[PDB]
Structure formats: structure tokens, C-alpha cells
Design a protein around this ligand. Sequence first.
Ligand SMILES: Nc1ncnc2c1ncn2[C@@H]1O[C@H](COP(=O)(O)OP(=O)(O)O)[C@@H](O)[C@H]1O
Ligand code: NA
Ligand code: NA
Ligand code: NA
Lengths: 301, 291
Amino acid sequence: MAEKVAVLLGGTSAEREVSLLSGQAVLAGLKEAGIDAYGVDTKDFPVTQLKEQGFDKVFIALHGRGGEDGTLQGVLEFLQLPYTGSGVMASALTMDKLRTKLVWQALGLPISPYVALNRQQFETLSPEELVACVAKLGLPLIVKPSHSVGMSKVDHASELQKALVEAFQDSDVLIEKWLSGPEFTVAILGDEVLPSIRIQPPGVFYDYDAKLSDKTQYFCPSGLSDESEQQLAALALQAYHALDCSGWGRVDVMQDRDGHFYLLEVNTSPGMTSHSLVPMAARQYGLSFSQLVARILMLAD
Amino acid sequence: MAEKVAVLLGGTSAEREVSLLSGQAVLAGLKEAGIDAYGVDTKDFPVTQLKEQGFDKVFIALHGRGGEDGTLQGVLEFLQLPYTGSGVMASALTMDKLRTKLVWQALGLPISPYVALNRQQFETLSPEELVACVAKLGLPLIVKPSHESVGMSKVDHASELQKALVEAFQHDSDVLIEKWLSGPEFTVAILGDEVLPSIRIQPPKTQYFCPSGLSDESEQQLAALALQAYHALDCSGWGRVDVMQDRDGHFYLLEVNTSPGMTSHSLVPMAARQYGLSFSQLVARILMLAD
Ligand SMILES: Nc1ncnc2c1ncn2[C@@H]1O[C@H](COP(=O)(O)OP(=O)(O)O)[C@@H](O)[C@H]1O
Ligand code: NA
Ligand code: NA
Ligand code: NA
């Protein structure tokens, strides 16, 4: 009657090497807690066989494509295996920055002003009236695809059309007001919000590249005043529930010059390396790594 | 030589019986179009083995849980088989009536006034204060679980609210209370980028009218609106958008279905037929949109 637990790790995404390390750390925390867990490198073993192999429960320590995007969660729902983190809808929805924003926006949650663009709209429109479309956003701006890659900063209009030809490779592209920073991240564990962490990237984007730079620095405590922390904590929780997330995740948020926070995204299978954000926040919150993973596992049912 | 096509059908959802008819029909339409197609009852055959059995492409003719909700789509994405209809996100999002609405409201698309209630608000709030939360919506009201008849009611008087709320909350932790609309209902089939002719649905024994009776201007408006609604949720391949009118003729989006009925007497076949297509052409077009 004790559960056999698959720790899914590695995979075939560009984040494979981080995921190897996450799943390795998860596996050893689970074993420390006395969980009957086993490493499963999904690159070499088909996720569709987990049930055949005797597993009762899955801890997902994969990242990126096929790990945090709904596809693996559908496999697990098909097999009727319980698993960690968010379900099919939320896992997928969180990869789509346009629909994430629209949900948050319809709930009145704060996001930076923006304009989205289809293809049959990119094509239609004159470069010149593309800048009228965005003028109301002021300057500077960020231009990015809706699903990093093709991401770009813009300082005045002449520069815009270039960034827009990059981007459409991707029927949806986003054009938003540039925010000053700093950037913060808020880990969530079940219903509990963990201490926020301020992120300084080695200069401009905290993109995929700055998640293999040994430069990026995290601060926890973040340095926010007590009141700013409570507002950020309540906001992150709202943003997470807004998208139907469960188990655990990480909400990323950006301050602007006005001092207010703006929601960027929710990550539904965060890094779990000893150097990673959720473990960092969890330690500051008073949990050991091992307790953290035992608790994530308990939040799967 | 030719690609082999699995028509997934039947399954174990409540809709199994309808799906067997959908699939029987899809299979005959695909063979008639020249496609090398095979019926596959997913009750007996695990979808996870479609590739090892030699299938190249999948026509999805399953309905309900496990067919149109993203889980099947996830398996197929993992196997990297091309398949008909919407991807994971869209298939799953369209089962969440709350978030579907939120996405449509943020784009300025028309939906009926409503309020959302979570289980915490319930439990915390008294019957009288619940009545007050929904007073602005008037009467009558439709009460339903946010997730996809099960647990749905019509509330005609404030004193019936609590009970409707009780039932709904036994199916979900998210519940919607919506303003009743006086109708009629329409359904708009989408095929790739083409909007097919709308159908009018007259509740009672239900009557289906195609053409719908709308004027050319109204039909054109509805076609544009349906196509916006469908793109708003990231649908592709094909689908059906359900719309309703108020007494003034304004249109309101209800939902999008990402694996419609394909029986000889289903709505999408009826609209295709009015558009000039045989059922065989319809299904071949749908498959061709899968790559
Ligand atoms: N509107 C914005 N203003 C300023 N910086 C932004 C904005 N949007 C994104 N960024 C920066 O770009 C980074 C990555 O973008 P994000 O939308 O969070 O998704 P992705 O995971 O695709 O990189 C953030 O970590 C942040 O540094
Ligand atoms: Na995700
Ligand atoms: Na669906
Ligand atoms: Na009017």
C-alpha cells in the first residue's frame, strides 16, 4: 500500500540539462523523506508506460516543452495517475502569454498596457500605421511572441518594424510598455505564499540565456518594505488562482517606476536545483529541500 | 505508400453512443474520399499505442471527457501524431466556462452578465447575501458549475437560488450565475478559416433551422463574431460556436465545442450540407487541416 513514485526528469527539451539536475535533487529529497521514489529519464522511457511500470504517483521535475505545457499532464490524466503541479488547462494556458494576460485583465489584475497582433493584421497594415496602433503605449516598448526567442527592446518608432518581422516566424505577438523593474518572483506551495525574491539579470532581459550565466543575482529577502511584500503576496496568489494553477508554481512579477507591480507569468514546473528560485524561497520560509519536495508530493492527489 | 488514418471513436465517456455513430459516419466519409482509414474503439484499444500499430494521422471522433478536453490531445502530442481539431490548450480551455468568458470579456467580445462564485464565498456568505450578490442580474438566472446538464438549473425566484447553488457546488468549486436570455440560440460551425451557414435552434422535440432566418447583414455579423470567438480561445481545425440572442437581437457567446457530433443527423454535417459539401468532403477537409 505505500506509493511508488516516478520522478520525471531530463526529457528532450532545451532545458534537459537543468531538468536532469532538478530531478536528481528531487529524487534525493524524496528518498531522505522515505518516499519510494525512482528516477525516470523520459528521454529514454516513454511516459505512456508509467502505469505499466508499476508507478502510483508522479512528481514532475521536467521543464519546458512536453513537461510544463499540458501535454505530459494529459498523458497522466489518460493513465489516471496523480501528479504534482498544475493540471492540463493551467499548464497549457500558462505557456500562452496573450491568454494569460487576457484572463488576468478581465479579472482586473494588473498587467502592463499592451497591444497584440495576429498575422492577417501584421500583413494588412502599413509600417507607419503600425506605430499609430502602439503610440498610446509610449516609449520604450518590448515586442515578443505570444509563446525565449524573437524577443526585443524598442527605444523609438523607426526600430519597431524590425522587431515585428522577428517575432512573426507565431500568429500572435505582443507589444507592451517597457517596465523599469525590478523583477521579483513569488513561489506558491499549495495555498501558502513563500518569501519573494528579487532578481537582477546581468543586463536587460531575464530571458532563457540569463536562466547559463553565472552572473544573475537573486536577493531573498527581496528588500521590499513589509507592506509592499504583503501586496505582492496577495497579488501573486490571485494571479495563480486566476489561471487555475494548483499544487505549486512560481509567479513572476515586474515593478514599474510608479512602484506598482505588474504580472508577467506563472511557471508551472519550476527549477528545483539547489541553486534554483523555489528552493531558495522555501529555505527562507523555513523549509528544508526535503520537506519542500515531500510537501509538493503531498499536494498531488 | 498511403498514410494510415485512425478514426478514434466510442470511448468511455457518457457520450459513447453518439461517438460510435460519429465515428461510423466519419469512417465511411473518409474511405469514400479515398483515404485509408480504420475505425478504432478507444474503449478496447489504448490511444497510447496508435503509433506502434502503424497509424500516421488521427481523426478524433470522441466526445466529452477524454475526447474534447485536452487529455487525448496531450497523448497525441506526445506520440507526435497529427490530429484533427484544436490543440491541448484550446481543447481544455473550452471546458472551463469561467475562463472562456474571461478571455472573451477581455477582448471586448459580448457575453451575458454574470457572477462567478467560488466555494469559499459560498460557505462564508449567507443565503440572503448571496441573493444580493446576484440581484443586479435580475431574474430568471442560470446556475452552473464552471466546468463541463449535470448540476445546472434555472432559478425563477430568489428563494430558489440557494438550492441551485447547493447542487452546482457538488460538481465544482467554481460556479457561474448568469442572466437568462430570451433566445433564440444559434450554432456556427467553423472549418479551418471558413465559417459555415449558421443554424437556428428552437428549444421545445427541438427544431433545427438552416438557413437560420437571419438577414444577410446579421448572418455576416454572426459569422465574424463566431470566428473571433473561436480564434480568441486558440481553436483550430474545426469546431462549433454556440451563440444566443437577447430580446433586442444582440448576440452573446455561450461556448465553443472542440469535437462536435458527426452523426448523419448532427449539426456540423447539416451546416456543411447547406454550404455545398457532402459529409465525405466535410471530413476530408477536416483531416486535411491536420498535419
Ligand atoms: N513589459 C515588460 N517590461 C520590461 N521587461 C519585460 C516585460 N516583459 C518581459 N520582460 C522581461 O523579459 C523577461 C522574460 O519575459 P516573460 O514574458 O516573463 O517570458 P519568457 O519566459 O518567454 O522569457 C522577464 O524576465 C523580464 O526581464
Ligand atoms: Na505551464
Ligand atoms: Na474542448
Ligand atoms: Na443595441
